[PDB]
Write a protein that binds this ligand. Structure first.
Ligand SMILES: [Mg+2]
Ligand SMILES: [Mg+2]
Ligand SMILES: [Mg+2]
Ligand SMILES: [Mg+2]
Ligand SMILES: [Mg+2]
Ligand SMILES: [Mg+2]
Ligand SMILES: [Mg+2]
Ligand SMILES: [Mg+2]
Ligand SMILES: [Mg+2]
Ligand SMILES: [Mg+2]
Ligand SMILES: [Mg+2]
Ligand SMILES: [Mg+2]
Ligand SMILES: [Mg+2]
Ligand SMILES: [Mg+2]
Ligand SMILES: [Mg+2]
Ligand SMILES: [Mg+2]
Ligand SMILES: [Mg+2]
Ligand SMILES: [Mg+2]
Ligand SMILES: [Mg+2]
Ligand SMILES: [Mg+2]
Ligand SMILES: [Mg+2]
Lengths: 100, 156, 99, 127, 206, 84
RNA sequence: CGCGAAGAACCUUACCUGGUCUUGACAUCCACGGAAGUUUUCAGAGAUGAGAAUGUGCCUUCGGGAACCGUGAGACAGGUGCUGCAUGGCUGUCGUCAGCUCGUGUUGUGAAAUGUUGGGUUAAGUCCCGCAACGAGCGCAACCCUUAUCCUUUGUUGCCAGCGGUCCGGCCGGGAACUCAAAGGAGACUGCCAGUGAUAAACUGGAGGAAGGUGGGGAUGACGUCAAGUCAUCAUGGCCCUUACGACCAGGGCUACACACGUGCUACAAUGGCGCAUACAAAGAGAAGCGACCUCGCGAGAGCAAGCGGACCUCAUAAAGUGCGUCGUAGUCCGGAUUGGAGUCUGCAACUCGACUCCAUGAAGUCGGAAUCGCUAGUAAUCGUGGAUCAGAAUGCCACGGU
């Protein structure tokens, strides 16, 4: 892909790592809980206050070997065609061409 | 079709009476992959005729079949560049096939209270030969008489 | 305390070699055993588009098959459990011993 | 003590047992008339009980799993047929000629890439 | 038309997977990346070591790397100093200790990687491609190849237009599944473009 | 719509600037890029220069518009017609 | 032309406006202080700039390093910038069509021919006969996968013929016979009979047989064609920028609408609609995930929370079906667009521009012109179910089963 795009993505996942366990989950739960009142409003302001790159939805998983945004697979972490060629060389265990 | 010739397909016979024709009739009546309801209506139609005509409904459907089974057809062809409706004698496996097909749509245009009821009336009115089936068969006969002029055209 | 051995491997030949090398080690320590049972092998099928730029009908199907075997030990011993730890097995099969 | 039969029409399995009896059949701890709603589905089970005279002398416990209504009925038919095979093995010239011992190997076809219904190809314009 | 990869089609039958390790979805892609890192780093600094095959094994608590090559002397060095440095770096790649087992190939010309890399290397050394492919084919047959096929394509001889050139001696039953075809592809970076080289070697069946 | 339990939406910079302007009286248009914020009655009777992509369109806050969003009154496309 | 895109609110994003940077977001090296992190505030749309506290790790020849952080300089990095008509790799196409060749011999002055043609036959250059050809190879076929039958092996997390117990439900001891799970093996070869045929090959019918003529499908795509597609997966020759075709941000656009085309989903209905009772599937997913039971909510959902890395736990019960009664041919108890009001859930945020629920409205449409497409058996047709992509976003795509 582009080195700029890959650098962008590494920064995004690092900030999400940094912030997912410290505020994000607890702010979500304290907005959902009906026991509290108006402390949820205060929480929403501080949630917006964060650098906003911390959302894991801000992340787009890409082929780490090539950075291609489209045609991604989660189990192999690669683009569609990159999985194919690596499979032909035999680098994915237990993988072959299906027939049924 | 073009290289290997093959024969007809065998169809499991009618379970309630042992016929092959009733099974084929209900199959061609079947629409959209629904044979469950098709079996129900065919049994209801035959029993209405059983109480109306003689007890043995087998013969009643048989006569309602024979008075509408066609022995001559109309086939569209082009040999020298002109439309030829050649009439040919049809072998009985196709005779009875085309007859029951026409009866199927004849009932649909009857437009009675229910599909079962209209089939019963159609099959009954064919027994007296006043049916729209006989109307269609007289219609094909007049055009068949008309096609005897084509009968000696190319590819007789 | 009857224990239950679970074995996962991509290759069917490898699981049979593994389940046939564990058992005689059980005989080496000298404990009666029960026969391994084939739990339903799981097949995963990934269908991937093969052309780099554009096609749709040209697509290949790749399946991963994971085979799963169960072993039940009826009367364990410290020597038997020491044998399970000490015995060496193929890198293609993982260990899921359960007390 | 109990003659065994197996039947499989499409994707179902049938477990069929024979004992002497008074012509009564139970299906999945349920009467056949209650279980098979369809009349054709009902009487396909008892079709081989006419050409074979043993209809009135056999109580028949059956358990059938999997498949659908017609498939389970066809599986039921094939299972009773085989269960009879280990009893008399002398009515073959009639039973085979009807076509009941034959296992219906016909099966639903796998979907194909570039096809919508595993044989239907998408409708296209020539232009 | 296009051909299936002869290694990939016969991977499940006669061709041992390069990676022969198991885990769950949790670390599948993670250890796949580690194998990529190991293989690319290994190849890049053993380009001269005539590396042919790399087999990565993942026992439950380590990684094992089997390097099938033709020059063990270069890849080990004196008293094994080089294999220990590769151990340090390769282990640090995956974050786990690493065993390195070096297997030797007595007949380099019957393995599809050595012949492919040699033919490619001759191109940037400016050896003419027709003679190069012929030299490879003659070597394989003399040293006991049952069948050989070589494919050199792309910008042959500095021409304007790329041409396809192939030459087959012996027997290459690709459509036969039990046939043992060792296939590899290598590339040549020349001042007039980039050249693909394909090699099929048949060495009997079953 | 954002769920009633979560309340309405408003931006921190917008909220802080609206209350300062309200406290200091409606004096000047409020420059904003936050189209996603929601019109809250605290800014009634004010002109908001909402961004559409190239030019900040003024909008006046009135009672009947409250609840609708700040970026709603800024059509980002200019399509006169397919005729001449 | 439901193509790359297995999924555009932000991101993706490569486009636009505007604010911005110029050894740079990304890599190697030079100099300086330094661990990262945590709390806090101010300007701003954020980038960024600014304020303030805590902190100083390891080996140590106390000489430095890595995670690195921040500024200056240079080799430069960086270009999803151009040329697929320079290329590699990969792919489409005829087409799974049956062809493409070689050795020796023979023929021809020779290029070459013959083999490979011809009579038949086959799915096939498949086989047979003839034939100056005899053989051989790549392709066809076979070996690989799945399904159809049986035998043997192991029996839990799957099964319950029999034994008893039966909280009367495979629930308990208990059984491994069976369904099933998966591992190996046997069988289907024109094998035998008859007829046709040219006593050949083949074709047709028959017997047995679970399966009979390649058993049904899948993978496998020869030599070559199209300067076919891709320089935007990637790599790469050449060309161009390198205070800008590079890079960081906030908003917008890729969703615009006088129209045309292609591919689909939902219908126009009575084989249907509507309501109740009632029965069975296969395949898969699931650890930042599937989420039971119970309670509240018409509802999508919310609360509490069991269990499940799974043949156990959860999405999970299927739908057309059947039995009942009404609808009674009516733009209708059809059809569902569209529109209003109120809501739920994701996410920082649903205005442009997400999906779903409840109430309110009920548009075209009563089967469609010339023309045109798919399909030969569980196949069309039709009915549901699952997966990847995925925070959320299917009528698309890939799979599964029912009639
Ligand atoms: Mg790049
Ligand atoms: Mg996303
Ligand atoms: Mg289907
Ligand atoms: Mg192919
Ligand atoms: Mg965008
Ligand atoms: Mg942007
Ligand atoms: Mg081209
Ligand atoms: Mg010759
Ligand atoms: Mg001569
Ligand atoms: Mg030829
Ligand atoms: Mg010739
Ligand atoms: Mg010739
Ligand atoms: Mg011939
Ligand atoms: Mg063929
Ligand atoms: Mg041949
Ligand atoms: Mg010949
Ligand atoms: Mg083949
Ligand atoms: Mg071109
Ligand atoms: Mg082009
Ligand atoms: Mg688009
Ligand atoms: Mg999704």
């Amino acid at each position: 892909a582009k080195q700029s795009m890959k650098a962008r993505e590494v920064k995004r996942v690092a900030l999400a790592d940094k912030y997912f366990a410290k505020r994000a989950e607890l702010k979500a739960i304290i907005s959902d809980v009906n026991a509290s009142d108006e402390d949820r409003w205060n929480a929403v302001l501080k949630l917006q206050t964060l650098p906003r790159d911390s959302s894991p939805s801000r992340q787009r998983n890409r082929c780490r070997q090539t950075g291609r945004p489209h045609g991604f697979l989660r189990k192999f972490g690669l683009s569609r065609i990159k999985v194919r060629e690596a499979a032909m060389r035999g680098e994915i265990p237990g993988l072959k061409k299906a027939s049924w | 079709p073009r290289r290997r010739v093959i024969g007809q397909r065998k169809i499991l016979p009618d379970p309630k009476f042992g016929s092959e024709l009733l099974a084929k009739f209900v199959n061609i009546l079947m629409v959209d992959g629904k044979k469950s309801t098709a079996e129900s209506i065919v049994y209801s139609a035959l029993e209405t005729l059983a109480q109306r005509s003689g007890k043995s409904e087998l013969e009643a459907f048989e006569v309602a079949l024979e008075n509408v089974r066609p022995t001559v057809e109309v086939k569209s062809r082009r040999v020298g560049g002109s439309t030829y409706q050649v009439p040919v004698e049809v072998r009985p496996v196709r005779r009875n096939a085309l007859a029951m097909r026409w009866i199927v749509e004849a009932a649909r245009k009857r437009g009675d209270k229910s599909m079962a009821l209209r089939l019963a009336n159609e099959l009954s009115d064919a027994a007296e030969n006043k049916g729209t089936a006989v109307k269609k068969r007289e219609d094909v006969h007049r055009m068949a008489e008309a096609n005897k002029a084509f009968a000696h055209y190319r590819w007789l | 305390q009857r224990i239950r051995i679970r074995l996962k491997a991509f290759d069917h030949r490898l699981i049979d070699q593994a389940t046939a090398e564990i058992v005689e080690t059980a005989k080496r320590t000298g404990a009666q055993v029960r026969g391994p049972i084939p739990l339903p092998t799981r097949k995963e099928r990934f269908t991937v588009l093969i052309s780099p730029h554009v096609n749709k009908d040209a697509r290949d199907q790749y399946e991963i098959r994971t085979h799963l075997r169960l072993v039940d030990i009826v009367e364990p011993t410290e020597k038997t459990v020491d044998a399970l730890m000490r015995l060496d097995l193929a890198a293609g099969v993982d260990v899921q011993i359960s007390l | 003590n109990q003659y065994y039969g197996t039947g499989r029409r499409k994707s179902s399995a049938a477990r069929v047992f024979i004992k002497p009896g008074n012509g009564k059949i139970v299906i999945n701890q349920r009467s056949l008339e209650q279980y098979f709603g369809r009349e054709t589905a009902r009487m396909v089970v008892r079709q081989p009980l006419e050409l074979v005279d043993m209809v009135e002398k056999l109580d028949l416990y059956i358990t059938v799993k999997g498949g659908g209504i017609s498939g389970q009925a066809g599986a039921i038919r094939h299972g009773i047929t085989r269960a009879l095979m280990e009893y008399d093995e002398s009515l073959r010239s009639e039973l085979r000629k009807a076509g009941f011992v034959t296992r219906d190997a016909r099966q639903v076809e796998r979907k194909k890439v570039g096809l919508r219904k595993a044989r239907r190809r998408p409708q296209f314009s020539k232009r | 038309g296009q051909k299936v990869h002869p290694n990939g089609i016969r991977l499940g039958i006669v061709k041992p997977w390069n990676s022969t390790w198991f885990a769950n979805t949790k670390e599948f892609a993670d250890n796949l990346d580690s194998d990529f890192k190991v293989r690319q780093y290994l190849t890049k600094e053993l380009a001269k070591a005539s590396v042919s095959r790399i087999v990565i094994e993942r026992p439950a608590k380590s990684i094992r790397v089997t390097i099938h090559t033709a020059r063990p002397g270069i890849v080990i060095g004196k008293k094994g100093e080089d294999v220990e440095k590769l151990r340090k770096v390769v282990a640090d790649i995956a974050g786990v200790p690493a065993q390195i087992n070096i297997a030797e190939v007595r007949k380099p010309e019957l393995d599809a990687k050595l012949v492919a890399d040699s033919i490619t290397s001759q191109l940037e050394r400016r050896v003419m491609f027709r003679r190069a492919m012929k030299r490879a084919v003659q070597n394989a047959m003399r040293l006991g190849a049952k069948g050989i096929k070589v494919e050199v394509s792309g910008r042959l001889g500095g021409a304007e237009i790329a041409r396809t050139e192939w030459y087959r001696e012996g027997r290459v039953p690709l459509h036969t599944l039990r046939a043992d075809i060792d296939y590899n592809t290598s590339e040549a970076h020349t001042t007039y473009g980039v050249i693909g080289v394909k090699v099929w070697i048949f060495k009997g069946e079953i | 719509p954002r769920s009633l339990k979560k309340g309405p939406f408003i931006d921190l910079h917008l909220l802080k600037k609206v209350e300062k302007a309200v406290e200091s009286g409606d004096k000047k248009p409020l420059r904003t890029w936050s189209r996603r914020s929601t019109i809250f009655p605290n800014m009634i009777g004010l002109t908001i220069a909402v961004h559409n992509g190239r030019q900040h369109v003024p909008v006046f806050v009135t009672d009947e518009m409250v609840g609708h969003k700040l970026g709603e009154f800024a059509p980002t496309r200019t399509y006169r017609g397919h005729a001449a």
